[PDB]
Design a binder for this molecule. Structure first.
Ligand SMILES: Nc1nnc(N)c2[nH]cnc12
Ligand SMILES: Nc1nnc(N)c2[nH]cnc12
Lengths: 257, 257
């Protein structure tokens, strides 16, 4: 049991009742309208949070791209919005524009000032494992270490524990077998005592294992998400929200959550 | 590691390389032809064994229904065939007609003479947990006990250990929460030291949890099959073979098998 709640301005995410789903989102009128449509579609079929992200596969632009997105969806889909950036000034504008959770693929390493931004608005922050290189003495030990330096940065910045989520960053700075192997030892991040988000939606190593292009990776995302939840993580971040919402309630039922 | 092989007349199923998939099969010309088509389709998309079954949801008929089915598919799809009966004389005819594995939903309780039939042809037998009633002092303890009486019957009948597979019989003589709870403690059957088959394909308690009719239970079958494999079982028996074959290779990759 957690004994606290994920508070997010207007919204609250109890963390015991069920595994929380994060829907990935794919300033003119056409974009802001395919996005409100799509955010709506995700609220409709199980999502618990919308993640508005650059595709990762200039600063002034990110604001311009993303601020409009948030204004609309927050005003139109009543769910907490997470902003997927690693730039501070961007994140600044986004909560400022309406978004409630941060979500940083550089776990405060790339832009330390971001963490302060969190402390400041009291917004939960996701800290993802990542590194400019990828050679490890020992994978699991080494990523638990790294994550711990993120937390350190968060904390020295003023961020309360209760606002801290970790993510093993499956997909980044990782060989295909390395990804798999983190997958096998997900349980270990548990010992740091924070809620964990898993993010594995149609990543390349599913491709690698199954031999299958992005739009054929829905069953592999499946397997990751289950073996995820059964190693006890608190959110999954995914593209295919109808299907994952259902594998989640199933796992929940079975592992009894 | 197992140190033996599942030998099946002409075919051999190594049990370490991967989780083995069992495709469920759904004497005129039309039936024997929808069945060869469908058996073929399953060989094509991942199955490792075909299971030819009465739908369970007179003796002389079962032979007549099922003997033709086997003759054709064994002659046409080159894979080992399991016959899903609990009658002895039926099973008799089926291996006799060509089928290689037995598969008994009454774990030798309903018709003890069946076990002898196995000893006799040396065909691997699946023994499923089941009971004419369903009130337990203690579920897991009680089903491990029951299974143990099946094995006893098998052994006293001459059946070699290496031909013995167990199945927790999720779906039978079980309340919805009871099913779930067996699901959570699958690992326990492991201590009896035989290969386990899980059989949960679109069963009712997925319906119960997810609230969803048989043709909408593919993601829930998913969850069962993963949490299955991650609790270490050796086959899954399923309807939707494209999709499960893929969640299986994924799990395999991740748990490293
Ligand atoms: N691309 C991503 N952005 N934010 C996250 N939190 C992720 N986890 C796994 N992949 C990602
Ligand atoms: N209906 C079934 N027949 N044979 C099996 N082995 C099963 N396991 C779960 N359901 C079944």
């Amino acid at each position: 049991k957690w004994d606290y709640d994920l508070r997010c301005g207007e919204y609250t995410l109890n963390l015991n009742e069920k595994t929380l789903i994060m829907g990935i989102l794919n300033g003119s009128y056409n974009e802001v309208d395919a996005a409100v449509r799509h955010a709506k579609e995700m609220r409709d079929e199980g999502a618990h949070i919308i993640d508005i992200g650059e595709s990762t596969r200039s600063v002034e632009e990110e604001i311009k791209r993303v601020v409009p997105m948030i204004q609309a969806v927050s005003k139109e889909v009543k769910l907490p919005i997470s902003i997927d950036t690693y730039k501070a000034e961007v994140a600044k504008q986004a909560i400022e524009a309406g978004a409630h959770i941060i979500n940083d693929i550089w776990g405060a390493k790339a832009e330390p000032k971001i963490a302060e931004v969190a402390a400041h608005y009291d917004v939960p922050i996701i800290l993802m494992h990542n590194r400019d290189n990828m050679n490890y003495r020992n994978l699991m030990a080494d990523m638990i270490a790294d994550l711990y330096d993120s937390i350190k940065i968060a904390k020295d910045a003023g961020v309360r524990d209760e606002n801290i989520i970790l993510d093993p960053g499956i997909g980044f700075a990782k060989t295909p077998e390395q990804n798999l192997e983190a997958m096998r030892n997900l349980e270990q991040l548990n010992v740091l005592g924070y809620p964990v988000l898993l993010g594995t939606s149609r990543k390349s190593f599913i491709g690698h294992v199954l031999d299958l292009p992005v739009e054929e990776r829905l069953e592999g995302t499946g397997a990751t998400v289950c073996l995820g939840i059964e190693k006890g993580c608190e959110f999954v971040r995914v593209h295919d929200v109808k299907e994952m919402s259902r594998m989640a309630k199933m796992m929940d039922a079975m592992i009894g959550k």
